[PDB]
């Protein structure tokens, strides 16, 4: 084990593939809060402001590192972990 020193935008709304954010909270993890995205629609909003079913909103997922308390509840000992986080959505052509 190693010693570690522990020391916006409205795109989610104006996007043609808009998303909602959700507070993923885990007291056994550093960071305890991770904001994850879920696309609002199946389609994408077109130039006329309507949902176009010919296009699809898809989440963009990113692998990130987090610290997991080990043993549980420990304030000063963790294990490194990799998790997949949905950050936002993009519109894709099929």
């Amino acid at each position, epitope marked *: 084990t190693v010693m570690v020193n522990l020391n916006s935008s409205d795109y989610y709304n104006r996007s043609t593939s808009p998303w*909602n954010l*959700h507070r993923n909270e885990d*007291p056994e*993890r550093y960071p305890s809060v991770i904001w994850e995205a879920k696309c609002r629609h*199946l389609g994408c909003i077109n130039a006329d402001g309507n949902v176009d079913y010919h296009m699809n909103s*898809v989440p963009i997922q990113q692998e990130i590192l987090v610290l997991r308390r080990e043993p549980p509840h420990s304030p000063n000992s963790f294990r490194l972990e990799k998790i997949l986080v949905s950050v936002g959505c993009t519109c894709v052509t099929p």
Partner: antibody
Amino acid sequence: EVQLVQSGAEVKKPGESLKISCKGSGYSFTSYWIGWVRQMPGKGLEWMGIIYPSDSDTRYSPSFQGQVTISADKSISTAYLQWSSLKASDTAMYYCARYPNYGAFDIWGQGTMVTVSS
Amino acid sequence: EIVLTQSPATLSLSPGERATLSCRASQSVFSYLAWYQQKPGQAPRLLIYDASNRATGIPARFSGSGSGTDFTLTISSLEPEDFAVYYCQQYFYWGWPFGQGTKLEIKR
């Protein structure tokens, strides 16, 4: 052990209200969604709706919107499924299941059988 | 608006035989697809997630493949405990998560 434990079998009369529970343990209840699934005797799995216990965001299947209410009490890691007025047609097994965002239902409750009869 | 349709409705095979189960989505679900096994009076059990990843403890005879609209679950050589209902499930957009199920019964 990561699990979801559901409340016991229910026998209710038509017109009565019912709230069934699903308690998670061994994991962060505020890091995953919970889905509710109905299974009528000898039939397939039907999605009823979901909840993200961290913020109580809920979505329902069009067949269940306005018929049931899904809720959660994150202080006791519990999700709920409730009917205001039961009907005989609500006689079915009800499962709760965990799933991470854009992930499969990986942990399942044991099911709650609900029988509705006069 | 996504619907999954499974084929066949009932697959009749003998122990030792290779089983091929199909799942077609009404539009792409990318790789946000899972397969479950369900025995009578029991909860569904996750077999495959992300179209092709075997869940922990699931035997190697089970394999999943596909992407977009067409998916397959293959059981290389049927064991007696493999006769059950199988469901495919999408978690891209709801829509409807579950396929209607394929009953894998013993042939005669």
